[PDB]
Subunit: 138 residues, 4 copies
Amino acid sequence: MGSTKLKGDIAQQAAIMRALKMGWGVLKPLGDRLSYDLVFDVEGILLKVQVKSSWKSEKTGNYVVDNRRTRGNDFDFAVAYVEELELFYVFPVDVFISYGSEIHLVETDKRQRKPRSFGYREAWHLILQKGAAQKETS
Amino acid sequence: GSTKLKGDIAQQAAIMRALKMGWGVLKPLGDRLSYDLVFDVEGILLKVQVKSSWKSEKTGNYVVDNRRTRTNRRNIVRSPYRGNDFDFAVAYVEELELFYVFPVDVFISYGSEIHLVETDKRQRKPRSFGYREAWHLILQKGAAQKET
Amino acid sequence: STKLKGDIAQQAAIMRALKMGWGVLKPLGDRLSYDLVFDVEGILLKVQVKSSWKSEKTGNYVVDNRGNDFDFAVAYVEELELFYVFPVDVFISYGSEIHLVETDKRQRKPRSFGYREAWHLILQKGAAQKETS
Amino acid sequence: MGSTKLKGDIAQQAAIMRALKMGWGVLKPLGDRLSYDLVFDVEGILLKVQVKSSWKSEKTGNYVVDNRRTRTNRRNIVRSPYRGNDFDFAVAYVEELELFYVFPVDVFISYGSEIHLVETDKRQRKPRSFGYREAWHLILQKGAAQKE
DNA sequence: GAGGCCTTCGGGCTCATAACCCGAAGGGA
DNA sequence: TCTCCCTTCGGGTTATGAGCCCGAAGGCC
Ligand SMILES: [Ca+2]
Ligand SMILES: [Ca+2]
Protein backbone atom coordinates (compact mmCIF):
# COMPACT_ATOMS: atom_id res chain seq x y z
CA MET A 1 0.00 0.00 0.00
CA GLY A 2 2.39 2.72 1.26
CA SER A 3 5.79 1.53 2.53
CA THR A 4 9.18 3.18 3.27
CA LYS A 5 9.97 3.46 -0.47
CA LEU A 6 6.83 5.61 -0.75
CA LYS A 7 7.29 7.67 2.46
CA GLY A 8 10.66 8.89 1.12
CA ASP A 9 8.97 9.64 -2.21
CA ILE A 10 6.53 12.12 -0.62
CA ALA A 11 9.40 13.69 1.32
CA GLN A 12 11.30 14.25 -1.93
CA GLN A 13 8.26 15.82 -3.62
CA ALA A 14 7.55 18.01 -0.60
CA ALA A 15 11.08 19.44 -0.77
CA ILE A 16 10.68 20.09 -4.49
CA MET A 17 7.45 21.96 -3.77
CA ARG A 18 9.09 24.13 -1.12
CA ALA A 19 11.98 24.95 -3.47
CA LEU A 20 9.50 25.87 -6.21
CA LYS A 21 7.57 28.10 -3.83
CA MET A 22 10.91 29.78 -3.08
CA GLY A 23 11.15 30.53 -6.82
CA TRP A 24 14.27 28.38 -7.09
CA GLY A 25 15.13 25.85 -9.80
CA VAL A 26 15.36 22.13 -9.05
CA LEU A 27 17.56 19.51 -10.76
CA LYS A 28 17.13 15.74 -10.41
CA PRO A 29 20.02 13.26 -10.94
CA LEU A 30 19.92 9.99 -12.90
CA GLY A 31 20.03 6.86 -10.72
CA ASP A 32 20.87 6.75 -7.01
CA ARG A 33 24.66 6.39 -7.25
CA LEU A 34 25.19 10.08 -6.39
CA SER A 35 25.53 11.34 -2.79
CA TYR A 36 22.58 13.79 -2.95
CA ASP A 37 18.91 13.37 -3.88
CA LEU A 38 18.21 16.88 -5.24
CA VAL A 39 19.96 20.10 -6.25
CA PHE A 40 18.41 23.57 -5.95
CA ASP A 41 19.24 26.44 -8.28
CA VAL A 42 19.16 29.35 -5.86
CA GLU A 43 19.54 32.29 -8.25
CA GLY A 44 22.29 30.67 -10.33
CA ILE A 45 24.13 28.90 -7.51
CA LEU A 46 23.59 25.11 -7.45
CA LEU A 47 23.34 23.53 -4.00
CA LYS A 48 23.35 19.78 -3.36
CA VAL A 49 20.58 18.59 -1.05
CA GLN A 50 19.89 15.19 0.52
CA VAL A 51 16.28 14.39 1.42
CA LYS A 52 15.40 12.56 4.65
CA SER A 53 12.09 11.55 6.22
CA SER A 54 11.33 11.23 9.94
CA TRP A 55 9.46 8.55 11.94
CA LYS A 56 7.12 9.16 14.92
CA SER A 57 8.95 6.92 17.48
CA GLU A 58 8.29 5.38 20.94
CA LYS A 59 5.48 6.97 22.99
CA THR A 60 6.46 9.82 22.70
CA GLY A 61 5.23 13.08 21.15
CA ASN A 62 8.37 13.64 19.04
CA TYR A 63 10.06 12.52 15.80
CA VAL A 64 13.43 10.97 14.82
CA VAL A 65 15.75 10.95 11.77
CA ASP A 66 18.96 9.01 10.94
CA ASN A 67 22.20 9.48 8.97
CA ARG A 68 23.82 6.46 7.28
CA ARG A 69 26.94 7.41 5.28
CA THR A 70 28.28 3.83 5.57
CA ARG A 71 25.73 2.44 3.08
CA GLY A 72 28.21 8.45 0.87
CA ASN A 73 29.19 11.97 1.94
CA ASP A 74 29.44 15.57 0.63
CA PHE A 75 26.27 17.49 -0.16
CA ASP A 76 25.33 20.95 1.19
CA PHE A 77 21.98 20.67 2.97
CA ALA A 78 19.91 17.89 4.50
CA VAL A 79 16.13 18.27 4.67
CA ALA A 80 14.14 16.19 7.17
CA TYR A 81 10.40 15.76 6.60
CA VAL A 82 7.61 15.25 9.10
CA GLU A 83 4.57 13.93 7.20
CA GLU A 84 2.15 14.62 10.06
CA LEU A 85 2.93 18.32 10.55
CA GLU A 86 3.87 18.94 6.90
CA LEU A 87 7.09 20.63 8.06
CA PHE A 88 10.80 20.57 7.19
CA TYR A 89 14.02 20.78 9.19
CA VAL A 90 16.89 22.08 7.06
CA PHE A 91 20.41 21.17 8.22
CA PRO A 92 23.77 22.31 6.81
CA VAL A 93 26.34 19.57 6.01
CA ASP A 94 28.60 20.04 9.04
CA VAL A 95 25.71 20.35 11.52
CA PHE A 96 24.10 17.23 10.02
CA ILE A 97 27.25 15.07 10.17
CA SER A 98 28.14 16.40 13.65
CA TYR A 99 25.32 14.29 15.07
CA GLY A 100 26.30 10.79 16.21
CA SER A 101 23.40 8.40 15.62
CA GLU A 102 19.81 9.70 15.66
CA ILE A 103 18.64 13.31 15.41
CA HIS A 104 15.74 14.13 17.72
CA LEU A 105 13.05 16.51 16.49
CA VAL A 106 10.62 17.77 19.12
CA GLU A 107 7.45 19.59 18.07
CA THR A 108 5.00 19.82 21.04
CA ASP A 109 3.60 23.00 22.61
CA LYS A 110 6.81 24.19 24.24
CA ARG A 111 7.58 25.15 27.86
CA GLN A 112 10.87 23.22 27.97
CA ARG A 113 14.45 23.35 26.67
CA LYS A 114 14.48 22.32 23.01
CA PRO A 115 17.18 20.18 21.27
CA ARG A 116 20.02 21.60 19.14
CA SER A 117 17.98 20.70 16.04
CA PHE A 118 15.09 23.04 16.91
CA GLY A 119 17.00 26.07 15.57
CA TYR A 120 16.98 24.44 12.13
CA ARG A 121 13.19 24.10 11.92
CA GLU A 122 11.99 25.51 8.57
CA ALA A 123 15.41 27.21 8.36
CA TRP A 124 15.30 27.66 4.58
CA HIS A 125 17.06 31.02 4.99
CA LEU A 126 20.30 29.12 5.69
CA ILE A 127 20.33 27.75 2.15
CA LEU A 128 19.17 31.15 0.86
CA GLN A 129 22.23 32.63 2.61
CA LYS A 130 24.78 30.04 1.41
CA GLY A 131 23.83 30.96 -2.17
CA ALA A 132 24.40 34.68 -1.60
CA ALA A 133 27.68 34.04 0.25
CA GLN A 134 29.00 31.69 -2.44
CA LYS A 135 28.18 34.26 -5.16
CA GLU A 136 30.62 36.72 -3.54
CA THR A 137 33.41 34.13 -3.21
CA SER A 138 33.68 34.01 -7.03
CA GLY B 1 7.55 34.16 -10.74
CA SER B 2 7.46 34.16 -14.55
CA THR B 3 4.50 32.09 -15.84
CA LYS B 4 6.06 28.59 -16.25
CA LEU B 5 7.19 28.60 -12.61
CA LYS B 6 3.58 29.06 -11.50
CA GLY B 7 2.48 26.17 -13.70
CA ASP B 8 5.20 23.92 -12.29
CA ILE B 9 3.99 24.64 -8.75
CA ALA B 10 0.43 23.60 -9.65
CA GLN B 11 1.83 20.55 -11.43
CA GLN B 12 3.86 19.68 -8.34
CA ALA B 13 0.79 20.12 -6.14
CA ALA B 14 -1.12 17.69 -8.33
CA ILE B 15 1.71 15.17 -7.97
CA MET B 16 1.54 15.25 -4.17
CA ARG B 17 -2.21 14.64 -4.22
CA ALA B 18 -1.80 11.51 -6.35
CA LEU B 19 0.95 10.18 -4.09
CA LYS B 20 -1.19 10.67 -0.97
CA MET B 21 -3.93 8.63 -2.67
CA GLY B 22 -1.41 5.86 -3.42
CA TRP B 23 -1.51 6.35 -7.19
CA GLY B 24 1.62 6.03 -9.34
CA VAL B 25 2.96 9.21 -10.96
CA LEU B 26 4.59 9.43 -14.37
CA LYS B 27 6.35 12.58 -15.54
CA PRO B 28 6.65 13.00 -19.33
CA LEU B 29 9.97 14.14 -20.79
CA GLY B 30 9.82 17.69 -22.17
CA ASP B 31 6.98 20.16 -22.73
CA ARG B 32 5.97 18.55 -26.03
CA LEU B 33 3.02 16.29 -25.18
CA SER B 34 -0.57 17.45 -24.67
CA TYR B 35 -0.62 16.33 -21.01
CA ASP B 36 1.39 17.24 -17.93
CA LEU B 37 1.08 14.03 -15.93
CA VAL B 38 -0.36 10.53 -15.98
CA PHE B 39 -1.52 8.54 -12.95
CA ASP B 40 -1.14 4.81 -12.54
CA VAL B 41 -4.48 4.16 -10.86
CA GLU B 42 -4.58 0.58 -9.52
CA GLY B 43 -3.16 -0.69 -12.83
CA ILE B 44 -4.52 1.58 -15.55
CA LEU B 45 -3.00 4.89 -16.68
CA LEU B 46 -4.94 8.15 -17.03
CA LYS B 47 -3.45 11.26 -18.64
CA VAL B 48 -3.89 14.53 -16.72
CA GLN B 49 -3.65 18.15 -17.85
CA VAL B 50 -2.74 20.64 -15.12
CA LYS B 51 -3.70 24.33 -15.17
CA SER B 52 -3.07 27.06 -12.61
CA SER B 53 -5.89 29.55 -12.04
CA TRP B 54 -5.76 33.30 -11.43
CA LYS B 55 -8.04 35.40 -9.22
CA SER B 56 -9.95 37.96 -11.30
CA GLU B 57 -9.66 41.54 -10.01
CA LYS B 58 -13.28 42.65 -10.53
CA THR B 59 -15.35 39.45 -10.16
CA GLY B 60 -13.51 38.20 -7.05
CA ASN B 61 -13.10 34.59 -8.20
CA TYR B 62 -10.54 32.26 -9.82
CA VAL B 63 -10.55 31.35 -13.52
CA VAL B 64 -8.76 29.03 -15.99
CA ASP B 65 -8.84 28.83 -19.81
CA ASN B 66 -9.15 25.80 -22.11
CA ARG B 67 -7.53 27.23 -25.26
CA ARG B 68 -3.94 27.11 -26.52
CA THR B 69 -2.58 30.18 -28.29
CA ARG B 70 -0.11 31.32 -30.96
CA THR B 71 0.47 35.00 -31.80
CA ASN B 72 2.81 35.68 -34.72
CA ARG B 73 3.51 38.89 -36.69
CA ARG B 74 0.37 38.97 -38.88
CA ASN B 75 -2.35 37.01 -37.07
CA ILE B 76 -3.26 34.88 -34.02
CA VAL B 77 -4.73 31.34 -34.04
CA ARG B 78 -6.07 28.96 -31.37
CA SER B 79 -5.94 25.22 -30.73
CA PRO B 80 -8.49 23.72 -28.31
CA TYR B 81 -7.98 20.21 -26.90
CA ARG B 82 -9.39 17.16 -28.67
CA GLY B 83 -11.13 14.43 -26.65
CA ASN B 84 -8.22 12.00 -26.73
CA ASP B 85 -5.62 14.64 -25.71
CA PHE B 86 -5.94 13.47 -22.09
CA ASP B 87 -8.35 11.88 -19.59
CA PHE B 88 -8.76 14.56 -16.91
CA ALA B 89 -8.08 18.25 -16.32
CA VAL B 90 -7.21 19.55 -12.85
CA ALA B 91 -7.44 23.23 -11.93
CA TYR B 92 -5.40 24.53 -9.00
CA VAL B 93 -6.11 27.51 -6.79
CA GLU B 94 -2.87 28.35 -5.00
CA GLU B 95 -3.84 30.47 -1.95
CA LEU B 96 -6.52 27.95 -1.01
CA GLU B 97 -4.80 24.58 -1.52
CA LEU B 98 -7.67 23.50 -3.73
CA PHE B 99 -8.29 21.32 -6.77
CA TYR B 100 -11.19 20.96 -9.18
CA VAL B 101 -11.01 17.83 -11.34
CA PHE B 102 -12.80 17.76 -14.71
CA PRO B 103 -13.18 15.00 -17.31
CA VAL B 104 -11.95 15.98 -20.80
CA ASP B 105 -15.44 16.46 -22.26
CA VAL B 106 -16.62 18.57 -19.32
CA PHE B 107 -13.45 20.63 -19.80
CA ILE B 108 -13.58 21.12 -23.60
CA SER B 109 -17.37 21.69 -23.40
CA TYR B 110 -16.65 25.20 -22.05
CA GLY B 111 -16.34 28.12 -24.49
CA SER B 112 -13.13 29.70 -23.27
CA GLU B 113 -12.70 30.95 -19.69
CA ILE B 114 -14.10 28.68 -16.99
CA HIS B 115 -14.82 30.38 -13.68
CA LEU B 116 -14.60 28.81 -10.24
CA VAL B 117 -16.37 30.58 -7.36
CA GLU B 118 -15.43 30.01 -3.72
CA THR B 119 -17.39 32.92 -2.22
CA ASP B 120 -20.55 32.19 -0.17
CA LYS B 121 -22.15 33.94 -3.17
CA ARG B 122 -25.79 33.00 -2.30
CA GLN B 123 -26.26 32.49 -6.09
CA ARG B 124 -26.84 28.91 -7.31
CA LYS B 125 -23.18 28.57 -8.50
CA PRO B 126 -22.14 27.61 -12.06
CA ARG B 127 -21.75 24.01 -13.26
CA SER B 128 -18.05 24.06 -12.31
CA PHE B 129 -18.79 23.75 -8.56
CA GLY B 130 -19.86 20.11 -8.93
CA TYR B 131 -16.18 19.21 -9.35
CA ARG B 132 -14.48 20.50 -6.17
CA GLU B 133 -12.03 17.75 -5.15
CA ALA B 134 -13.68 15.41 -7.66
CA TRP B 135 -10.87 12.87 -7.15
CA HIS B 136 -13.52 10.12 -7.09
CA LEU B 137 -14.19 10.73 -10.82
CA ILE B 138 -10.63 9.69 -11.68
CA LEU B 139 -10.89 6.72 -9.28
CA GLN B 140 -14.21 5.65 -10.88
CA LYS B 141 -12.82 5.88 -14.42
CA GLY B 142 -10.09 3.59 -13.10
CA ALA B 143 -12.42 0.69 -12.24
CA ALA B 144 -14.38 1.40 -15.44
CA GLN B 145 -11.39 0.21 -17.51
CA LYS B 146 -10.26 -2.40 -14.96
CA GLU B 147 -12.51 -5.25 -16.19
CA THR B 148 -11.78 -6.96 -19.56
CA SER C 1 27.59 -0.61 -8.14
CA THR C 2 26.33 -1.79 -11.56
CA LYS C 3 23.42 0.67 -11.22
CA LEU C 4 25.30 2.62 -13.93
CA LYS C 5 24.92 -0.27 -16.40
CA GLY C 6 21.15 -0.12 -15.86
CA ASP C 7 21.22 3.68 -16.19
CA ILE C 8 22.91 3.39 -19.58
CA ALA C 9 20.39 0.77 -20.75
CA GLN C 10 17.49 3.04 -19.80
CA GLN C 11 18.89 6.17 -21.48
CA ALA C 12 19.54 4.14 -24.62
CA ALA C 13 15.91 2.99 -24.54
CA ILE C 14 14.64 6.55 -24.00
CA MET C 15 16.69 7.63 -27.03
CA ARG C 16 15.26 4.84 -29.21
CA ALA C 17 11.70 5.91 -28.40
CA LEU C 18 12.45 9.53 -29.28
CA LYS C 19 14.22 8.37 -32.44
CA MET C 20 10.82 7.00 -33.49
CA GLY C 21 8.90 10.11 -32.40
CA TRP C 22 7.17 8.60 -29.36
CA GLY C 23 6.62 10.25 -25.99
CA VAL C 24 8.48 8.95 -22.94
CA LEU C 25 7.16 8.94 -19.38
CA LYS C 26 9.18 8.33 -16.20
CA PRO C 27 7.78 7.13 -12.82
CA LEU C 28 8.87 8.82 -9.60
CA GLY C 29 10.68 6.38 -7.30
CA ASP C 30 10.97 2.63 -7.86
CA ARG C 31 7.69 1.28 -6.50
CA LEU C 32 6.25 0.35 -9.90
CA SER C 33 6.55 -2.85 -11.98
CA TYR C 34 7.84 -0.98 -15.06
CA ASP C 35 10.79 1.31 -15.77
CA LEU C 36 9.38 3.38 -18.63
CA VAL C 37 6.19 3.99 -20.61
CA PHE C 38 6.02 5.11 -24.25
CA ASP C 39 3.34 7.29 -25.79
CA VAL C 40 2.92 5.64 -29.18
CA GLU C 41 0.67 7.83 -31.35
CA GLY C 42 -1.51 8.31 -28.24
CA ILE C 43 -1.36 4.79 -26.79
CA LEU C 44 0.58 4.31 -23.54
CA LEU C 45 2.69 1.15 -23.36
CA LYS C 46 4.70 0.20 -20.26
CA VAL C 47 8.25 -1.10 -20.74
CA GLN C 48 10.85 -2.75 -18.53
CA VAL C 49 14.47 -1.99 -19.30
CA LYS C 50 17.07 -4.64 -18.52
CA SER C 51 20.77 -4.81 -19.41
CA SER C 52 22.81 -7.91 -20.31
CA TRP C 53 26.30 -9.19 -19.45
CA LYS C 54 28.68 -11.21 -21.67
CA SER C 55 28.99 -14.98 -21.12
CA GLU C 56 32.31 -16.23 -19.72
CA LYS C 57 32.64 -19.44 -21.76
CA THR C 58 30.63 -18.94 -24.96
CA GLY C 59 30.62 -15.72 -27.05
CA ASN C 60 27.05 -14.87 -26.00
CA TYR C 61 25.03 -12.42 -23.87
CA VAL C 62 22.61 -13.28 -21.05
CA VAL C 63 19.79 -11.37 -19.29
CA ASP C 64 17.99 -12.29 -16.02
CA ASN C 65 14.44 -11.37 -14.97
CA ARG C 66 12.81 -11.21 -11.53
CA GLY C 67 -0.99 -10.53 -19.00
CA ASN C 68 -1.57 -7.53 -16.71
CA ASP C 69 1.04 -4.70 -16.66
CA PHE C 70 4.50 -4.70 -18.33
CA ASP C 71 3.32 -5.44 -21.92
CA PHE C 72 6.92 -4.92 -23.20
CA ALA C 73 10.55 -5.40 -22.16
CA VAL C 74 13.73 -4.17 -23.84
CA ALA C 75 17.14 -5.83 -23.44
CA TYR C 76 20.40 -3.96 -23.93
CA VAL C 77 23.86 -5.06 -25.03
CA GLU C 78 26.34 -2.18 -24.62
CA GLU C 79 29.36 -3.13 -26.82
CA LEU C 80 27.08 -4.23 -29.66
CA GLU C 81 24.65 -1.30 -29.59
CA LEU C 82 21.35 -3.18 -30.00
CA PHE C 83 18.09 -3.96 -28.24
CA TYR C 84 16.04 -7.11 -27.85
CA VAL C 85 12.40 -6.13 -27.44
CA PHE C 86 10.22 -8.90 -25.98
CA PRO C 87 6.44 -8.80 -25.48
CA VAL C 88 5.62 -9.58 -21.83
CA ASP C 89 4.16 -13.06 -22.57
CA VAL C 90 7.18 -14.23 -24.62
CA PHE C 91 9.41 -12.75 -21.90
CA ILE C 92 7.89 -14.54 -18.87
CA SER C 93 7.76 -17.75 -20.95
CA TYR C 94 11.41 -18.34 -20.00
CA GLY C 95 13.07 -20.29 -17.17
CA SER C 96 15.41 -17.73 -15.58
CA GLU C 97 18.38 -16.61 -17.68
CA ILE C 98 17.46 -15.92 -21.33
CA HIS C 99 20.43 -16.20 -23.73
CA LEU C 100 21.26 -14.02 -26.74
CA VAL C 101 23.48 -15.05 -29.66
CA GLU C 102 24.85 -12.21 -31.82
CA THR C 103 27.82 -14.00 -33.43
CA ASP C 104 27.62 -15.35 -37.00
CA LYS C 105 28.37 -18.95 -36.00
CA ARG C 106 26.13 -20.50 -38.72
CA GLN C 107 24.26 -22.78 -36.25
CA ARG C 108 20.48 -22.49 -35.73
CA LYS C 109 20.17 -19.21 -33.81
CA PRO C 110 17.79 -19.45 -30.77
CA ARG C 111 14.15 -18.35 -30.40
CA SER C 112 15.48 -15.08 -28.90
CA PHE C 113 17.05 -13.90 -32.18
CA GLY C 114 13.58 -13.22 -33.67
CA TYR C 115 13.23 -10.23 -31.34
CA ARG C 116 16.22 -8.29 -32.69
CA GLU C 117 15.28 -4.59 -32.95
CA ALA C 118 11.63 -5.63 -33.37
CA TRP C 119 10.41 -2.12 -32.46
CA HIS C 120 7.55 -2.73 -34.92
CA LEU C 121 5.98 -5.03 -32.30
CA ILE C 122 5.55 -1.95 -30.08
CA LEU C 123 4.09 -0.03 -33.02
CA GLN C 124 1.80 -2.98 -33.84
CA LYS C 125 0.37 -3.40 -30.32
CA GLY C 126 -0.05 0.39 -30.39
CA ALA C 127 -2.01 0.49 -33.65
CA ALA C 128 -3.99 -2.59 -32.57
CA GLN C 129 -4.93 -0.86 -29.29
CA LYS C 130 -6.91 1.72 -31.30
CA GLU C 131 -9.18 -1.08 -32.62
CA THR C 132 -10.58 -1.73 -29.11
CA SER C 133 -11.66 1.98 -29.06
CA MET D 1 5.48 15.83 -39.30
CA GLY D 2 6.25 16.14 -35.55
CA SER D 3 9.13 18.59 -35.22
CA THR D 4 11.17 21.19 -33.28
CA LYS D 5 11.15 20.19 -29.56
CA LEU D 6 11.49 16.51 -30.48
CA LYS D 7 14.77 17.22 -32.30
CA GLY D 8 15.96 19.30 -29.33
CA ASP D 9 15.06 16.49 -26.93
CA ILE D 10 17.03 13.98 -29.03
CA ALA D 11 20.17 16.15 -29.02
CA GLN D 12 19.69 16.60 -25.28
CA GLN D 13 19.41 12.81 -24.95
CA ALA D 14 22.62 12.34 -26.95
CA ALA D 15 24.45 14.66 -24.55
CA ILE D 16 22.99 12.62 -21.68
CA MET D 17 24.69 9.48 -23.00
CA ARG D 18 28.01 11.16 -23.82
CA ALA D 19 28.29 12.53 -20.28
CA LEU D 20 27.41 9.14 -18.77
CA LYS D 21 29.94 7.32 -20.94
CA MET D 22 32.63 9.69 -19.67
CA GLY D 23 31.67 8.71 -16.12
CA TRP D 24 30.09 12.05 -15.25
CA GLY D 25 26.92 12.65 -13.26
CA VAL D 26 23.86 13.92 -15.13
CA LEU D 27 21.21 16.20 -13.63
CA LYS D 28 17.88 16.95 -15.35
CA PRO D 29 15.85 20.06 -14.36
CA LEU D 30 12.19 20.83 -13.53
CA GLY D 31 10.79 21.99 -16.87
CA ASP D 32 11.65 24.37 -19.70
CA ARG D 33 12.18 27.57 -17.70
CA LEU D 34 15.92 27.56 -16.94
CA SER D 35 18.71 28.90 -19.15
CA TYR D 36 20.36 25.46 -19.32
CA ASP D 37 19.23 21.99 -20.40
CA LEU D 38 21.54 19.67 -18.41
CA VAL D 39 24.03 19.84 -15.52
CA PHE D 40 27.09 17.58 -15.49
CA ASP D 41 28.66 16.54 -12.22
CA VAL D 42 32.34 16.47 -13.17
CA GLU D 43 34.60 15.14 -10.40
CA GLY D 44 32.21 16.57 -7.78
CA ILE D 45 31.82 20.00 -9.40
CA LEU D 46 28.52 20.87 -11.13
CA LEU D 47 28.63 22.56 -14.53
CA LYS D 48 25.71 23.79 -16.63
CA VAL D 49 25.31 22.86 -20.28
CA GLN D 50 23.08 24.37 -22.96
CA VAL D 51 22.20 21.86 -25.67
CA LYS D 52 21.46 22.89 -29.26
CA SER D 53 20.73 20.67 -32.27
CA SER D 54 22.11 21.93 -35.58
CA TRP D 55 20.62 21.91 -39.07
CA LYS D 56 22.09 21.19 -42.51
CA SER D 57 22.32 24.58 -44.20
CA GLU D 58 21.56 23.48 -47.77
CA LYS D 59 23.02 26.55 -49.53
CA THR D 60 26.36 26.56 -47.64
CA GLY D 61 26.73 22.80 -46.95
CA ASN D 62 27.41 23.44 -43.27
CA TYR D 63 25.74 22.58 -39.98
CA VAL D 64 24.67 25.68 -38.06
CA VAL D 65 23.19 26.91 -34.76
CA ASP D 66 21.85 30.25 -33.51
CA ASN D 67 23.39 31.58 -30.28
CA ARG D 68 20.53 33.89 -29.35
CA ARG D 69 17.33 32.82 -27.61
CA THR D 70 14.90 34.23 -30.16
CA ARG D 71 11.53 34.51 -28.43
CA THR D 72 8.28 34.67 -30.41
CA ASN D 73 4.54 34.10 -29.93
CA ARG D 74 4.44 37.82 -29.07
CA ARG D 75 3.60 39.70 -32.32
CA ASN D 76 6.91 41.49 -31.66
CA ILE D 77 10.26 39.75 -32.23
CA VAL D 78 12.74 40.27 -29.39
CA ARG D 79 16.22 38.78 -29.63
CA SER D 80 17.82 38.21 -26.24
CA PRO D 81 21.34 36.74 -26.29
CA TYR D 82 22.80 34.70 -23.41
CA ARG D 83 24.61 36.06 -20.35
CA GLY D 84 28.02 34.78 -19.26
CA ASN D 85 26.35 33.32 -16.17
CA ASP D 86 23.37 31.62 -17.85
CA PHE D 87 25.43 28.43 -18.26
CA ASP D 88 29.01 27.10 -18.46
CA PHE D 89 29.12 25.21 -21.79
CA ALA D 90 27.00 25.16 -24.93
CA VAL D 91 27.01 21.84 -26.76
CA ALA D 92 26.12 21.92 -30.45
CA TYR D 93 25.04 18.59 -31.91
CA VAL D 94 25.16 17.03 -35.35
CA GLU D 95 22.83 14.04 -35.44
CA GLU D 96 23.49 11.86 -38.53
CA LEU D 97 27.20 12.27 -37.77
CA GLU D 98 26.68 11.71 -34.01
CA LEU D 99 29.00 14.71 -33.64
CA PHE D 100 29.36 17.07 -30.69
CA TYR D 101 31.02 20.46 -30.51
CA VAL D 102 31.57 21.85 -27.03
CA PHE D 103 31.81 25.62 -26.63
CA PRO D 104 32.49 27.55 -23.43
CA VAL D 105 29.98 30.34 -22.66
CA ASP D 106 32.30 33.26 -23.38
CA VAL D 107 33.19 32.00 -26.87
CA PHE D 108 29.57 30.95 -27.52
CA ILE D 109 28.06 34.37 -26.66
CA SER D 110 30.84 36.20 -28.57
CA TYR D 111 29.25 35.28 -31.90
CA GLY D 112 26.78 37.56 -33.59
CA SER D 113 23.84 35.21 -34.26
CA GLU D 114 24.77 32.13 -36.33
CA ILE D 115 27.78 29.90 -35.66
CA HIS D 116 28.85 27.53 -38.45
CA LEU D 117 30.39 24.05 -38.38
CA VAL D 118 32.21 23.26 -41.64
CA GLU D 119 32.79 19.47 -41.26
CA THR D 120 33.52 19.14 -45.01
CA ASP D 121 36.69 18.42 -47.00
CA LYS D 122 38.82 20.95 -48.93
CA ARG D 123 38.12 24.52 -47.78
CA GLN D 124 40.20 27.72 -47.87
CA ARG D 125 39.95 28.46 -44.14
CA LYS D 126 38.69 26.73 -41.01
CA PRO D 127 35.87 28.39 -39.01
CA ARG D 128 36.58 29.91 -35.60
CA SER D 129 34.58 26.92 -34.33
CA PHE D 130 37.08 24.37 -35.69
CA GLY D 131 39.18 23.88 -32.55
CA TYR D 132 36.06 22.97 -30.57
CA ARG D 133 35.16 19.66 -32.21
CA GLU D 134 34.48 17.17 -29.40
CA ALA D 135 36.38 19.48 -27.03
CA TRP D 136 35.13 17.76 -23.84
CA HIS D 137 38.50 18.42 -22.19
CA LEU D 138 37.60 22.11 -21.90
CA ILE D 139 34.88 21.14 -19.43
CA LEU D 140 37.36 18.96 -17.53
CA GLN D 141 39.69 21.96 -17.22
CA LYS D 142 37.03 24.26 -15.79
CA GLY D 143 36.10 22.00 -12.89
CA ALA D 144 39.64 21.14 -12.02
CA ALA D 145 39.91 24.93 -12.04
CA GLN D 146 36.79 25.20 -9.87
CA LYS D 147 38.05 22.89 -7.12
CA GLU D 148 40.74 25.02 -5.43
C1' DG E 1 -40.14 44.27 -15.69
C1' DA E 2 -35.83 46.57 -13.23
C1' DG E 3 -31.38 47.68 -12.20
C1' DG E 4 -28.14 45.22 -10.77
C1' DC E 5 -25.05 41.36 -9.29
C1' DC E 6 -23.19 37.70 -11.87
C1' DT E 7 -21.39 34.11 -15.67
C1' DT E 8 -20.12 32.99 -20.41
C1' DC E 9 -17.76 33.61 -24.58
C1' DG E 10 -14.26 35.17 -28.02
C1' DG E 11 -11.39 38.51 -29.18
C1' DG E 12 -6.84 40.67 -27.67
C1' DC E 13 -2.33 40.00 -24.92
C1' DT E 14 3.01 38.34 -22.60
C1' DC E 15 6.49 35.16 -20.86
C1' DA E 16 9.33 30.90 -21.63
C1' DT E 17 10.97 26.75 -24.71
C1' DA E 18 12.76 24.66 -29.38
C1' DA E 19 14.59 24.79 -34.67
C1' DC E 20 15.37 27.50 -39.08
C1' DC E 21 15.98 31.14 -43.47
C1' DC E 22 18.84 34.51 -46.11
C1' DG E 23 20.96 38.80 -47.94
C1' DA E 24 24.58 41.12 -47.85
C1' DA E 25 28.98 42.17 -45.01
C1' DG E 26 33.98 41.95 -45.60
C1' DG E 27 38.44 39.61 -44.01
C1' DG E 28 41.62 35.28 -45.57
C1' DA E 29 43.98 33.69 -49.37
C1' DT F 1 47.03 43.29 -59.75
C1' DC F 2 44.32 38.62 -54.80
C1' DT F 3 38.13 39.42 -56.67
C1' DC F 4 36.34 34.56 -55.51
C1' DC F 5 35.70 31.87 -51.60
C1' DC F 6 32.72 31.23 -47.66
C1' DT F 7 32.49 32.64 -42.58
C1' DT F 8 29.87 35.70 -40.28
C1' DC F 9 26.05 38.70 -38.77
C1' DG F 10 21.35 41.17 -38.14
C1' DG F 11 17.04 41.18 -40.12
C1' DG F 12 13.24 37.58 -41.26
C1' DT F 13 10.28 32.73 -39.97
C1' DT F 14 7.86 28.51 -37.54
C1' DA F 15 6.28 25.28 -33.87
C1' DT F 16 5.47 24.07 -28.64
C1' DG F 17 4.70 25.23 -23.57
C1' DA F 18 2.84 28.63 -19.41
C1' DG F 19 -0.77 32.17 -17.38
C1' DC F 20 -3.74 36.26 -18.49
C1' DC F 21 -7.28 40.90 -19.74
C1' DC F 22 -11.72 42.59 -20.83
C1' DG F 23 -15.95 43.72 -22.81
C1' DA F 24 -20.25 43.11 -25.20
C1' DA F 25 -24.01 39.54 -24.37
C1' DG F 26 -27.16 37.70 -21.46
C1' DG F 27 -28.86 34.85 -17.43
C1' DC F 28 -30.30 34.51 -11.78
C1' DC F 29 -33.20 36.19 -8.88
CA1 LIG G 1 -0.35 22.79 -18.38
CA1 LIG H 1 18.63 24.04 -25.66
